Design an enzyme around this catalytic site. Structure first.
Site, PDB file in Angstrom:
ATOM      1  N   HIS A 147      52.623  72.282   8.407  1.00  0.00           N
ATOM      2  CA  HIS A 147      53.542  73.106   7.601  1.00  0.00           C
ATOM      3  C   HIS A 147      53.145  73.383   6.157  1.00  0.00           C
ATOM      4  CE1 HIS A 147      56.834  74.029  10.349  1.00  0.00           C
ATOM      5  NE2 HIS A 147      56.583  72.853  10.892  1.00  0.00           N
ATOM      6  N   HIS A 156      54.509  65.231  17.878  1.00  0.00           N
ATOM      7  CA  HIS A 156      55.736  65.883  17.412  1.00  0.00           C
ATOM      8  C   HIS A 156      56.531  66.508  18.553  1.00  0.00           C
ATOM      9  CE1 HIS A 156      58.049  67.623  14.025  1.00  0.00           C
ATOM     10  NE2 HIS A 156      58.248  68.648  14.836  1.00  0.00           N
ATOM     11  N   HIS A 192      51.353  68.549  14.130  1.00  0.00           N
ATOM     12  CA  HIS A 192      51.362  69.700  15.028  1.00  0.00           C
ATOM     13  C   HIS A 192      50.772  70.940  14.338  1.00  0.00           C
ATOM     14  CE1 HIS A 192      55.298  69.766  13.058  1.00  0.00           C
ATOM     15  NE2 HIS A 192      55.614  70.946  13.565  1.00  0.00           N
ATOM     16  N   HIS A 207      58.748  71.576   5.245  1.00  0.00           N
ATOM     17  CA  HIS A 207      58.899  72.358   6.457  1.00  0.00           C
ATOM     18  C   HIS A 207      58.492  73.808   6.114  1.00  0.00           C
ATOM     19  CE1 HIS A 207      61.099  74.295   9.933  1.00  0.00           C
ATOM     20  NE2 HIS A 207      60.200  73.510  10.504  1.00  0.00           N
ATOM     21  N   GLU A 211      60.365  65.532   9.309  1.00  0.00           N
ATOM     22  CA  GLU A 211      59.701  66.825   9.200  1.00  0.00           C
ATOM     23  C   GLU A 211      60.175  67.602   7.976  1.00  0.00           C
ATOM     24  OE1 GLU A 211      59.879  69.511  12.620  1.00  0.00           O
ATOM     25  OE2 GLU A 211      58.059  70.497  11.890  1.00  0.00           O
ATOM     26  N   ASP A 227      60.644  67.659  19.339  1.00  0.00           N
ATOM     27  CA  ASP A 227      61.926  67.867  18.652  1.00  0.00           C
ATOM     28  C   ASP A 227      63.161  67.656  19.539  1.00  0.00           C
ATOM     29  OD1 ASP A 227      61.777  68.608  15.721  1.00  0.00           O
ATOM     30  OD2 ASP A 227      60.371  70.120  16.476  1.00  0.00           O
ATOM     31  N   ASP A 258      54.775  69.957  20.146  1.00  0.00           N
ATOM     32  CA  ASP A 258      55.940  70.655  19.591  1.00  0.00           C
ATOM     33  C   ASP A 258      56.993  70.959  20.659  1.00  0.00           C
ATOM     34  OD1 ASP A 258      57.225  71.527  17.230  1.00  0.00           O
ATOM     35  OD2 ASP A 258      56.759  73.626  17.681  1.00  0.00           O
TER      36      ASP A 258
HETATM   37  N1  P5D Z   1      61.317  71.696  14.117  1.00  0.00           N
HETATM   38  C1  P5D Z   1      60.975  73.032  14.650  1.00  0.00           C
HETATM   39  C2  P5D Z   1      61.767  74.133  13.925  1.00  0.00           C
HETATM   40  C3  P5D Z   1      63.159  74.359  14.433  1.00  0.00           C
HETATM   41  C4  P5D Z   1      63.406  74.532  15.792  1.00  0.00           C
HETATM   42  C5  P5D Z   1      64.702  74.742  16.250  1.00  0.00           C
HETATM   43  C6  P5D Z   1      65.756  74.774  15.349  1.00  0.00           C
HETATM   44  C7  P5D Z   1      65.521  74.602  13.994  1.00  0.00           C
HETATM   45  C8  P5D Z   1      64.223  74.392  13.540  1.00  0.00           C
HETATM   46  P1  P5D Z   1      59.177  73.186  14.395  1.00  0.00           P
HETATM   47  O1  P5D Z   1      58.883  73.261  12.849  1.00  0.00           O
HETATM   48  O2  P5D Z   1      58.564  71.937  14.963  1.00  0.00           O
HETATM   49  C9  P5D Z   1      58.587  74.652  15.263  1.00  0.00           C
HETATM   50  C10 P5D Z   1      57.794  75.685  14.413  1.00  0.00           C
HETATM   51  C11 P5D Z   1      57.429  76.853  15.332  1.00  0.00           C
HETATM   52  C12 P5D Z   1      58.602  77.738  15.748  1.00  0.00           C
HETATM   53  O3  P5D Z   1      59.453  78.010  14.881  1.00  0.00           O
HETATM   54  O4  P5D Z   1      58.624  78.099  16.932  1.00  0.00           O
HETATM   55  C13 P5D Z   1      56.610  75.062  13.639  1.00  0.00           C
HETATM   56  O5  P5D Z   1      56.285  73.876  13.892  1.00  0.00           O
HETATM   57  O6  P5D Z   1      56.058  75.782  12.807  1.00  0.00           O
HETATM   58 ZN    ZN Z   2      59.695  70.197  14.589  1.00  0.00          ZN
HETATM   59 ZN    ZN Z   3      57.120  72.130  12.753  1.00  0.00          ZN
END
Ligand code: P5D
Ligand code: ZN
Ligand code: ZN
Length: 393
Positions: free
Chosen positions: A191, A20, A212, A150, A123, A22, A320
């Site tokens: 998640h 994963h 992740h 999510h 996601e 982003d 991540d």
């Molecule tokens: N897609 C990311 C969320 C995002 C990031 C940036 C703008 C919008 C949304 P994520 O779900 O991959 C990161 C998150 C931890 C965190 O928040 O640090 C988790 O995995 O649980």
């Molecule tokens: Zn993500």
């Molecule tokens: Zn995530």
């Protein structure tokens, strides 16, 4: 040679399949997909965790590119298509370094020619708008896993970071899992609530993944996986891809974040409030209590325990990168993986253990999804069921 030198040698033979990253959302948010402005053929270390040179330095041989979109905004389907388009454009722009991969065979083909296999994972189930046909369309466009939620519940699945809703998967939620099994799309249980994990494991006839997530026994946070769920992976055939997020993996960071969130509420702000006024409150907290910093050792602690409970055949890595703002020391960007591999060598992990962790488990799991899909596609047609039919109005 040193453990770091050995790690690099091992990664040259069996590189990391990362679960994963982003980058697409980061490109959406930083430059609205103006790819020239964040050209990954150049050094993007000032803006991003990811670029091509750092991926190669880090020993990444395949990447599930996240096509995450926000669940709290309308037009999730449109935004998901834009994310998919971003990945497609990146692949087209960098044919020397990237190769689209839709199958386990494509992953091996990429490895044989020294290109990074580029896959896609959605996601959150909100990306299908309660529509099984939309799920099938995402698969047709190349999506090969979907995280069932999510951070918020959706209509048919409960998130780990929300209140209980339907109690895991609803009837329609089970139907989604069945259709993912028939298509060959991996069920991703990052998640989701532990109830949802158990319901998905009950229902799925294919190996599932956590793209992740780390260990709840090591660090008690709902984003991590309980031992009882890890124990079911060997029977299911799936794999848990450890993540690096400090506020999930380091106890001190979990505690710090909880105290930061409490402090925000103490000042009358929602913990997610991002206004200048809320930021002032948070800055004052960090001033009196510095943010704790995780290390490679922190992540290795999770992998050690996950190996003990789930088994070495049921582990992977999901960094991540570009999805989270902070990183462990030694894992500051996508070039960091060899530091983790070196630490595991120092802890006595074998070369074959590590080839499973980086490469072989992920390829096995995707091949298994394909195998299950062959059987189900031959056995029945696609589902036409609606959420109203299965869950009621
Ligand atoms: N897609 C990311 C969320 C995002 C990031 C940036 C703008 C919008 C949304 P994520 O779900 O991959 C990161 C998150 C931890 C965190 O928040 O640090 C988790 O995995 O649980
Ligand atoms: Zn993500
Ligand atoms: Zn995530």
């Amino acid at each position: 040679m040193t453990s770091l030198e050995k790690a690099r040698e091992l990664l040259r033979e069996f590189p990391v399949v990362d679960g994963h990253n982003d980058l697409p959302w980061a490109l959406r948010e930083q430059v609205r997909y103006d790819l020239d402005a964040r050209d990954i053929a150049a050094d993007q270390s000032a803006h991003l965790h990811t670029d091509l040179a750092r991926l190669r330095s880090g020993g990444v041989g395949a990447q599930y590119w996240s096509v995450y979109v926000r669940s709290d905004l309308p037009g999730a389907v449109t935004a998901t298509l834009e994310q998919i388009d971003c990945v497609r454009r990146l692949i087209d722009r960098h044919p020397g370094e990237l190769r689209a991969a839709l199958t386990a065979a494509d992953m091996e083909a990429a490895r044989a020619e020294g290109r990074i296999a580029s896959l896609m994972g959605a996601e959150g189930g909100h990306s299908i708008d309660n529509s099984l046909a939309t799920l099938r369309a995402l698969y047709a466009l190349g999506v090969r896993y979907m995280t069932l939620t999510h951070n918020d519940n959706n209509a048919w699945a409960d998130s780990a970071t929300d209140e209980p809703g339907v109690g895991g998967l609803s009837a329609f939620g089970r139907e989604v899992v069945r259709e993912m099994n028939r298509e060959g799309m991996l069920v991703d249980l990052s998640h989701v609530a532990a109830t949802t994990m158990r319901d998905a494991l009950d229902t799925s006839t294919a190996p599932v993944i956590f793209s992740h997530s780390s260990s709840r026994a090591v660090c008690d946070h709902p984003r991590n996986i309980p031992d009882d769920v890890l124990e079911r992976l060997s029977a299911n055939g799936g794999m848990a891809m450890v993540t690096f997020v400090p506020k999930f993996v380091l106890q001190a960071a979990v505690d710090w974040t909880a105290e930061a969130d409490d402090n925000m509420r103490a000042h009358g702000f929602h913990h997610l409030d991002s206004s200048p006024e809320a930021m002032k409150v948070h800055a004052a907290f960090e001033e009196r209590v510095p943010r704790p910093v995780a290390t490679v050792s922190t992540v290795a602690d999770h992998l050690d325990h996950m190996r003990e409970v789930a088994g070495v055949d049921h582990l992977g890595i999901g960094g991540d990168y570009d999805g989270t703002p902070f990183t462990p020391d030694g894992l500051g960007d996508v070039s960091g993986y060899p530091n983790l591999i070196a630490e595991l060598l120092d802890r006595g992990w074998s070369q074959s253990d590590l080839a499973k962790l980086t490469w072989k488990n992920a390829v096995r799991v995707l091949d298994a999804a394909e195998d299950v899909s062959r059987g189900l596609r031959a056995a029945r047609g696609p589902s036409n069921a609606t959420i109203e039919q299965l869950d009621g109005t």
